[PDB]
Amino acid sequence: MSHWYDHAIIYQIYPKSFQDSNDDGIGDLNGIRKRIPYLQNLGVNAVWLNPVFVSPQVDNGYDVSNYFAIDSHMGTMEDMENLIKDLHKAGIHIIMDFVLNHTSDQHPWFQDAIKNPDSLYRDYYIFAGHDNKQPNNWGSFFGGSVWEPDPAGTGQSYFHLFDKRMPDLNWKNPEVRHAMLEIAEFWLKKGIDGLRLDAFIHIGKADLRQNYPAMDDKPVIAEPFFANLPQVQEWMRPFCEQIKEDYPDALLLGEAASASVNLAVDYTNKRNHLMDCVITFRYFTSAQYQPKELDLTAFKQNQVVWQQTLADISQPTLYWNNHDMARLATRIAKTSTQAKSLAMLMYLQRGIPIIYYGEELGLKNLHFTSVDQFEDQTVAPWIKEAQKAGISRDAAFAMVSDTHKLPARGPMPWNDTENNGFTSAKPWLNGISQDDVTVANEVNSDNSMFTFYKNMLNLKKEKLFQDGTYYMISTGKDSYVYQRDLGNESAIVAVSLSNKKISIDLPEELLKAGEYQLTNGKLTLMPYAGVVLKKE
């Protein structure tokens, strides 16, 4: 059999910034329903929306306090059932972020164990200790220890791998494993078509009695003790198999952020009955907020390694930018021409494109003043360093605004009405919006970024670019170039990464996507440009 997701094309929405439909300045699900026409015109066949479960919003809703309802700002279960009905009527699927490693301190289960030390929900989380002592030196990704002495408070301590308020689930206890399955099945019965299984690599944690020998004696971020353990695969296996059995058209898409490529195999290999695909973070490359310079050859090695090592097994995921990173323009594009060229570069390879909302319009990071807006701690102390450097106030803010995750959640600019018709009230975030793009301007203008992605996406649907093999061409270190072939038919994508015009040796030759080039047999590309050439 073949399933809908084999020929998938995914549009990621951070729904707080997509469309506000009740004038609170916060985007909602009814907003997204209003803009289904826009999505069809772009040609995306699936929407992955960010978490929308009831949640304290301590960490963009991945700190979940109730999987069975729906955050009040976003709307009502009625709205969500209708969104998944409307999208299905437009031939569009939907997939949700579902986090398997932790809940919030607010989840009923944790609230039972924090208040009853004799509760059976103490086993649903990870508790150990003597007299507010940490039983080992493991350190969280968010700072200090993974341990937090319980409020209950017996002089034990509960495990959190991230923030103190996001306690980890004990996957050893099979009562959690069924429960998480029940959450997944619940949503699949609603008719959501897949699920982004988040932080799943961390369900496995070592023998708690062990320490990691370190710098000493500060608690240490010991990935080996709580990432990619054999337990991960054995606990996921029945979880995945059960989902598949009952909902076989369901996409199970993993987050293996910075996992081994050999691990991406383990998680995606059909033999192991786990995941269909995996997002990886390994594609890419005062201290810490200085504008990023992509190590361009390193990108080429990883892009090839991944396309190659996964050729026989699984589709790679194809993405540029995100809700947790600076947008494409800003972070890496130098021009409208390169923005187009890069999208081409990445997405016409073998895989499933995941394109971030607003990337298609060629949006940039918002750019703004005041630490508060950032919802981040390190920005204040970091700006002080550059100021000492004597980089202007203006310039210091810019640098951080051009590198930080949060400026990449700008509201969609849809039109020329107030707040670009995103809302009517104060939008939940706003700043400079440097510089002004709107969907009205780009849906008409066939020169625009949008029209390029539209045409680019219709090409991607073709049997050549969906199912064909991939082979990266011998390297202009200047330029990214590769070939896609069905065996019967064949085409070459070629993209300039130089600001000076450059030349390419290749066979012969029909064009479809492209932005200014030469025709002889040898090929010359205008600066940062690129073209798709079908052979004979």
**CB of 19 or CB of 307, closer to Ca ion:** 19
| Minimum distance, C-beta of residue 74 to Ca ion, in the bound complex (Å) | 7
Indicate which single residue of 8, 18, 20, 470 sits in contact with Ca ion (rule: CB under 5 A): 20
Q: Which span (13-21, 167-175, 243-251, 253-261) binds Ca ion, by CB under 5 A?
A: 13-21
Instruction: Compute CA 227 distance to the chain's CA centroid, rounded to the nearest angstrom.
Output: 19
- How many angstroms separate the CA atoms of 98 and 109, rounded? 17
**Is residue 198 among the annotated active site residues?**
yes
- How many angstroms separate the CA atoms of 409 and 127, rounded? 36
- How many angstroms separate the CA atoms of 175 and 254, rounded? 22
The 3-state DSSP composition of the chain as helix, strand, coil percent (nearest 5) reads 35, 15, 50
| Minimum distance, C-beta of residue 322 to Ca ion, in the bound complex (Å) | 23
**CB of 28 or CB of 515, closer to Ca ion:** 28
DSSP classification of residue 407: G
87-92: list long-range contacts, CB under 8 Å, 24+ apart: 87/36, 87/47, 88/191, 90/36, 90/39, 90/40, 91/40, 91/45, 92/36, 92/39, 92/40, 92/44, 92/45, 92/46, 92/47
Question: What DSSP string runs through 431-476?
Answer: ---SS---HHHHHH-TTSHHHHHHHHHHHHTSHHHHH-EEEE-S--
**CB of 20 or CB of 97, closer to Ca ion:** 20
Q: Which span (17-25, 209-217, 376-384, 508-516) binds Ca ion, by CB under 5 A?
A: 17-25
**CB of 22 or CB of 231, closer to Ca ion:** 22
| Minimum distance, C-beta of residue 29 to Ca ion, in the bound complex (Å) | 9
220: amino acid identity, one letter: V
- Which residue in 199, 224, 29 sits closest to 98, CA to CA? 199
SS3 at position 307: helix
**The residue to which tokens 């003043």 are assigned:** 369
Tokens at 403, concatenated: 């590198």
| Minimum distance, C-beta of residue 478 to Ca ion, in the bound complex (Å) | 47
- How many angstroms separate the CA atoms of 377 and 56, rounded? 18
CB 35 within 8 A of CB 45: no
75-78: list long-range contacts, CB under 8 Å, 24+ apart: 75/28, 75/29, 75/30
**CB of 22 or CB of 451, closer to Ca ion:** 22
**CB of 16 or CB of 107, closer to Ca ion:** 16
- The residue nearest Ca ion at its CB is 28
**Is residue 86 among the annotated active site residues?**
no
* Catalytic one of 105, 198, 360, 442: 198
Indicate which single residue of 9, 10, 13, 26 sits in contact with Ca ion (rule: CB under 5 A): 26
| Minimum distance, C-beta of residue 32 to Ca ion, in the bound complex (Å) | 11
**CB of 22 or CB of 132, closer to Ca ion:** 22
CB 49 within 8 A of CB 94: yes
127-128 and 157-159 beta bridge pairing: antiparallel
| Minimum distance, C-beta of residue 22 to Ca ion, in the bound complex (Å) | 5
Q: Which span (22-30, 83-91, 200-208, 477-485) binds Ca ion, by CB under 5 A?
A: 22-30
* Catalytic one of 59, 255, 276, 402: 255
| Minimum distance, C-beta of residue 417 to Ca ion, in the bound complex (Å) | 17
Total residues in contact with Ca ion, by rule CB under 5 A: 5
Question: What DSSP string runs through 480-532?
Answer: EEEEEE-SS-EEEEEEE--SS-EEEE----EEEEESSB--SSEEEE-TT-EEE
**CB of 28 or CB of 266, closer to Ca ion:** 28
Cis before 63 (ω within 30)? no
Beta carbons within 8 Å of 277's beta carbon, 6+ residues apart: 5, 251, 253, 254, 268, 314, 315, 316, 317, 352
- How many angstroms separate the CA atoms of 52 and 314, rounded? 28
Indicate which single residue of 3, 4, 7, 22 sits in contact with Ca ion (rule: CB under 5 A): 22
278 binds Ca ion (CB under 5 A): no
| Minimum distance, C-beta of residue 423 to Ca ion, in the bound complex (Å) | 8
| Minimum distance, C-beta of residue 30 to Ca ion, in the bound complex (Å) | 8
24 binds Ca ion (CB under 5 A): yes
SS3 at position 23: coil
**CB of 73 or CB of 292, closer to Ca ion:** 73
SS3 at position 356: strand
Where is 222: in which H helix or E strand?
none
Q: Which span (21-29, 84-92, 206-214, 426-434) binds Ca ion, by CB under 5 A?
A: 21-29
Q: Which span (28-36, 40-48, 285-293, 315-323) binds Ca ion, by CB under 5 A?
A: 28-36
Indicate which single residue of 10, 12, 18, 28 sits in contact with Ca ion (rule: CB under 5 A): 28
- Tell me which residues in 49-108 interact with Ca ion (CB under 5 A): none
**CB of 77 or CB of 389, closer to Ca ion:** 77
Which positions are catalytic?
A: 198, 255
Contacts to Ca ion by CB under 5 A? 20, 22, 24, 26, 28
